[PDB]
Design an enzyme around this catalytic site. Structure first.
Site, PDB file in Angstrom:
ATOM      1  N   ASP A   3       0.763  -1.316   0.002  1.00 49.53           N
ATOM      2  CA  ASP A   3       0.047   0.015  -0.001  1.00 49.53           C
ATOM      3  C   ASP A   3       0.907   1.214   0.123  1.00 49.53           C
ATOM      4  O   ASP A   3       0.502   2.245  -0.771  1.00 49.53           O
ATOM      5  CB  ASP A   3      -0.928  -0.071   1.164  1.00 49.53           C
ATOM      6  CG  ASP A   3      -2.203  -0.872   0.972  1.00 49.53           C
ATOM      7  OD1 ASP A   3      -2.368  -1.336   0.075  1.00 49.53           O
ATOM      8  OD2 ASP A   3      -2.596  -1.258   2.266  1.00 49.53           O
ATOM      9  N   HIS A  24      -5.407  -1.350   1.640  1.00 47.00           N
ATOM     10  CA  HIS A  24      -5.727  -2.831   2.196  1.00 47.00           C
ATOM     11  C   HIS A  24      -6.157  -2.788   3.525  1.00 47.00           C
ATOM     12  O   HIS A  24      -5.176  -2.797   4.302  1.00 47.00           O
ATOM     13  CB  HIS A  24      -4.779  -3.833   1.567  1.00 47.00           C
ATOM     14  CG  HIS A  24      -4.865  -4.125   0.326  1.00 47.00           C
ATOM     15  ND1 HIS A  24      -3.964  -3.260  -0.778  1.00 47.00           N
ATOM     16  CD2 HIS A  24      -5.127  -5.281  -0.446  1.00 47.00           C
ATOM     17  CE1 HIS A  24      -4.225  -3.810  -1.787  1.00 47.00           C
ATOM     18  NE2 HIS A  24      -4.864  -4.989  -1.994  1.00 47.00           N
TER      19      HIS A  24
END
Lengths: 146, 146, 146
Positions: free
Chosen positions: A24, A72
């Site tokens: 991420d 996420h």
């Protein structure tokens, strides 16, 4: 021993969060650190990538170019000891993101199925399998900053 | 020692969840309990608030009046020991809420960057920084009870 | 002892995730395993169901027929010891799902209030209470597979 079991679970919980955070935040150091050199990361439909350099190949060449950004959220990570040195994990992941193609925002519900091996006392990933149960374009919604 | 490290991680994981639960459930006792008197909570764009009473000032006067209600889902909390008595945390938070202004429902994706200090054997927050990466009004969607 | 406390917390965190995973994956073995025979699961508006067989009765006859599928993301699980052998839990759950009635996709924000009892050294659920704060149909959005 209970102490060893709890320490192992903590190390593995950190490996798993490091996978999500590394992908991420696009932190190559964090993401590379969590894999044995023979670890296999398989994404259904894309293929199998091996080790720290395979993981970085997958995200730099296949995943990251497809997205402006994403996040996420990992929940429900559940660990089971196959043996003293091998652990199975299952986890439920919610992903929100901005896809380049069509400028679409997407909601993904995925299940991550993982394996970890202890070698000379140290835990790292030996396997990760990601499967998407929902891949849902969000009509009329675009994730934007403040 | 492994035991001390695991006990410290558990205490800090509880502090962090107590922040989210205290702000969401509007529990002033729980929220006040987690801060050293010189702890600093900074919200980008609002300012810096200090200690238990600063935390309560921020939520009673700036945050809570802006919202009918909200919920913060914390995931991926990752801790690192800077020293034996100082821990860095990073966490990914998904917030859903009902804004008073315009009667809008909002999705927020935030990163919480935290610090904890152990003093005379006890852990509390010394720093919290919240940054919003997504602040997304949800057209046509309003979060309602059953 | 710190070791016993940490081992108990880990066992209870696993029970709680096993509830969510068992209901989502429709794994009857996992779901049945986590309840004392006199445990009570109450859903506001539906009623009270007792023990492993009550849990399976609730999901097979009331819940699962209402949904094509769903996913529950558990976060912020916070445990408190009422006594050495009784623990209170609170947790925040985000549920996404596909309702049969009207073919609607739904977002649910729920709070799970739980109790666990240790009997002859073993932890299991003694109580679960689920309350929905948001039950939100999502106009124009349908959760679909890739």
């Amino acid at each position: 021993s209970d102490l060893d079991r709890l320490a192992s679970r903590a190390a593995i919980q950190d490996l798993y969060s490091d996978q999500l955070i590394g992908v991420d935040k696009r932190q190559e150091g964090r993401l590379a650190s969590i894999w044995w050199d023979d670890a296999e990361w398989t994404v259904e439909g894309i293929g199998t990538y091996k080790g720290p350099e395979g993981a970085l190949d997958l995200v730099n060449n296949v995943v990251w170019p497809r997205w402006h950004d994403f996040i996420h959220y990992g929940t429900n990570l559940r660990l089971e000891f196959v043996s003293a040195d091998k652990v199975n994990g299952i986890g439920d992941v919610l992903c929100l993101g901005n896809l380049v193609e069509g400028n679409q925002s997407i909601l993904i519900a995925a299940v991550y199925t993982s394996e970890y091996e202890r070698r000379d006392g140290v835990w790292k990933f030996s396997k990760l399998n990601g499967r998407m149960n929902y891949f849902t374009p969000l009509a009329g919604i675009h994730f934007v900053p403040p």
